[PDB]
């Protein structure tokens, strides 16, 4: 070969895998304290239920 | 709409490898060009007529 391919470039070669972001999720719920007192017929079984 | 995209960080994972044949490696000092190799053949002893 010849004698001036030592002059020439040879970078090397990566890989580059690139990622995103997440996902939030979420959830809701609802306590009522009107109608939800005619079940229950204790006081601390509500909040068992809220637990 | 206006903010340029944020990298977060970039991690370049890597590990090495081994050779598992490195306990036969033998370091001569790269003069000649030839090497040969040679045994004895066997000689059995002989019974002796001294007549």
């Given at each position: 070969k010849n004698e001036e391919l030592m002059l020439k470039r040879n970078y090397p070669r990566m890989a580059t895998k690139l990622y995103g972001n997440g996902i939030v999720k979420k959830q809701k719920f609802t306590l009522n304290?009107?109608?939800?007192?005619?079940?229950?017929?204790?006081?601390a079984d509500a909040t068992n239920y809220a637990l | 709409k206006y903010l340029f995209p944020k990298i977060n960080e970039t991690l370049l994972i890597d590990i090495a490898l081994g050779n598992r044949?490195?306990?036969?490696?033998k370091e001569q000092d790269f003069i000649g060009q030839y090497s040969e190799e040679y045994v004895i053949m066997d000689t059995v002893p002989i019974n002796m007529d001294l007549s």
């Open positions: 304290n009107n109608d939800t007192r005619f079940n229950f017929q204790t006081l | 044949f490195n306990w036969l490696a």
